[PDB]
């Protein structure tokens, strides 16, 4: 397996006019956001617990049931920010956690935010996912939440292929993100895209990942995009 995740090019978010600017505008945006839960959730800090509760139920099925249970030794939090998910979802379930995020200021704050259980965070990687290669055979769970909209379609596919090579036996990748009502929608404030369900499933499956589970998040505020979770390997 090519360790770079290379695949042939398929479809494109033609809503992304200039790829270099799509990435540089997002990096600039996050560099000035406050390193707080409110900053991570764009004013939706009030749904953080609801989000984490659903994620926990979703993941526990893979850790607790079946003949080929997913292990609990190590997880990778992709686009981790200050560690909201690492603190409340991953550290309680996995012995060690690695974090990767493009924003230096958030990795620095994460040391404070995570408190004492943060001593179980092994590595704080500062990298864009489009440039990041997780170590082979290292993670039981790779968690990718509210960040796939920051990658081009091609870089998303290649990143997931690199992730596949990083999973331990029985490991899974989880994507949890906003889904557009139709097509692909660019947010020019934070420089990210929202894609519809069919588009996302096609990116995953056409990248050669196997979709294991798919679940819509319930009980969210009426006014926001639907949020879905996918398990893949």
């Amino acid at each position: 397996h090519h360790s770079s995740g290379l695949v042939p090019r398929g479809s494109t978010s033609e809503v992304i006019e200039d790829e270099k600017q799509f990435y540089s505008k997002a990096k600039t945006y996050w560099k000035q956001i406050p390193p707080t839960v409110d900053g991570m959730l764009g004013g939706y800090g009030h749904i953080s617990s609801i989000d984490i509760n659903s994620s926990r139920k979703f993941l526990q099925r893979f850790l607790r049931e079946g003949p080929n249970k997913t292990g609990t030794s190590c997880a990778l939090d992709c686009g981790a920010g200050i560690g909201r998910i690492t603190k409340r979802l991953l550290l309680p379930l996995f012995r060690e956690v690695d974090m990767v995020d493009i924003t230096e200021d958030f990795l620095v704050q994460a040391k404070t935010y995570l408190g004492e259980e943060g001593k179980r965070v092994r590595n704080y990687f500062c990298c864009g996912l489009q440039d990041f290669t997780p170590e082979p055979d290292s993670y039981d769970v790779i968690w990718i939440q509210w960040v796939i909209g920051h990658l081009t379609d091609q870089h998303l596919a290649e990143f997931l292929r690199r992730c596949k090579g990083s999973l331990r036996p029985n490991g899974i990748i989880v994507i949890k993100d906003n889904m557009a009502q139709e097509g692909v929608i660019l947010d020019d404030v934070d420089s990210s895209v929202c894609r519809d369900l069919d588009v996302v499933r096609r990116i995953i499956c056409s990248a050669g990942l196997s979709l294991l589970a798919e679940e819509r998040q319930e009980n969210l505020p009426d006014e926001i995009y639907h949020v879905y979770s996918f398990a893949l390997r």
Binding site: M40, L41, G42, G43, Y44, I47, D51, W146, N178, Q181, I185, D187, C194, L220, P221, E223, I224, Y225, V227
Partner: peptide, 6 residues
């Protein structure tokens, strides 16, 4: 983040 339907 989660966000408002534009």
């Amino acid at each position: 983040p989660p966000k408002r339907i534009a």
